């Protein structure tokens with residue numbers, strides 16, 4: 001079995017797993033949507049009660065299954081629960097990361113295409129708010145092909161489609177080289193490049209000042225202290241830490257049987273929170289508060305993540321010295337943040353085809369890329385198909401799967417056996433208070449917030465096109481698990 005080469009590469013790959021498009025596009029919107037500092041109190045509590053303990057649990061289940069040559073949840077769930085229903089529930093560990101990748105890599109291709117056009121300077125040129133925002137709103141709308149009539153049909157540009165082929169190629173070139181020579185070798189290069197670009201953008205944004213305000217006013221808003229906020233904070237913690245995607249589990253399956261996971265997992269989770277709360281929150285919102293004030297920035301944040309990251313922020317930079325190049329640094333930061341994460345949610349399908357169907361790494365990567373590339377045409381051409389996948393897999397699915405794997409590992413497999421499996425080989429030991437959080441508090445926290453979510457919030461016909469296709473993806477993945485059974 002493939003293994004991580006160095007301790008540093010494991011941390012950076014796991015950090016690159018978590019540090020992604022959410023740190024810079026999704027977290028600023030959710031924090032500003034829910035009161036800035038008001039959102040942080042549930043966000044911090046969710047990180048301590050859900051994010052941290054589920055980090056250690058997924059590290060344990062991955063290393064446990066990896067020791068037996070099984071990197072994905074269809075087999076690992078069966079190793080922790082000798083039931084055929086554990087294999088069925090494990091399919092979500094293949095379905096969730098595959099569905100999320102189907103729209104994630106496409107949005108990642110947006111950042112690459114924008115970074116290219118912003119580097120060559122093929123960007124809209126506004127003259128001396130709507131008069132400068134419209135050239136950038138139309139720039140994104142022409143790139144992805146926003147519908148102009150009633151038909152919910154996206155018409156991507158030839159450039160956007162070609163950049164998506166390039167983006168898939170860059171993902172394949174990294175994945176096909178393996179864990180150590182591919183994912184780990186790229187993490188040692190991409191994470192320092194990511195941190196430097198983010199710190200520079202934070203510094204440059206902190207120098208923004210207009211009559212409407214300063215960047216410090218946005219920092220004061222996001223740090224000054226409703227069930228919907230608690231749902232938003234816990235959901236954000238899942239997505240930003242890559243929990244519930246089966247991605248941490250597959251990566252951890254290449255950690256050696258006796259290596260530390262307690263300190264290593266805690267460091268990667270901490271690195272992500274630093275990148276998100278310190279670096280990510282200090283760019284988008286402060287630059288918007290500087291140019292529009294706090295009240296308008298909360299209004300701009302409610303307009304969406306794509307609006308702030310692809311329209312508003314490049315339009316703000318277009319008013320500063322060298323802002324076109326600053327937009328390139330911004331979009332290149334997003335591309336490396338997405339690239340280190342998209343390879344992480346495609347590796348589970350790779351590891352499954354390798355471990356359970358005995359496919360060569362080359363074959364597993366190419367077929368996984370074929371499935372993602374083909375399925376992504378739904379996200380590229382059907383309007384709001386992206387939103388439907390992000391809801392079922394990236395929103396509902398991850399919280400459902402997070403509670404599922406905890407019950408399997410810490411209840412069905414045994415609370416004492418799981419706790420001993422987590423701390424085994426750890427440089428440090430998990431604080432004994434977290435044993436009771438894992439066994440009682442975390443599943444109670446998830447079950448309560450998940451019931452309010454289902455009972456109070458979940459209740460166009462084209463959404464069935466996406467539901468029909470991703471339900472078929474689950475059936476197809478179930479059939480592959482069945483074929484893996486028949487071989488044994």
Ligand SMILES: CCCCCCCCO[C@@H]1O[C@H](CO)[C@@H](O)[C@H](O)[C@H]1O
Nearest residue numbers: 145154155156157158159161162377
């Ligand atoms: C199931 C998929 C069958 C149809 C595959 C079509 C592949 C996409 O085709 C391409 O899409 C781009 C987006 O507008 C266009 O700019 C290109 O002109 C077109 O060649």
Ligand SMILES: CC(C)C[C@H](N)C(=O)O
Nearest residue numbers: 018020021022240242341
């Ligand atoms: C789906 C995950 C890889 C997302 C990633 N953790 C992010 O923050 O963008």
Ligand code: NA
Nearest residue numbers: 018019020240
């Ligand atoms: Na993140």
Ligand code: NA
Nearest residue numbers: 019337340341
């Ligand atoms: Na990443």
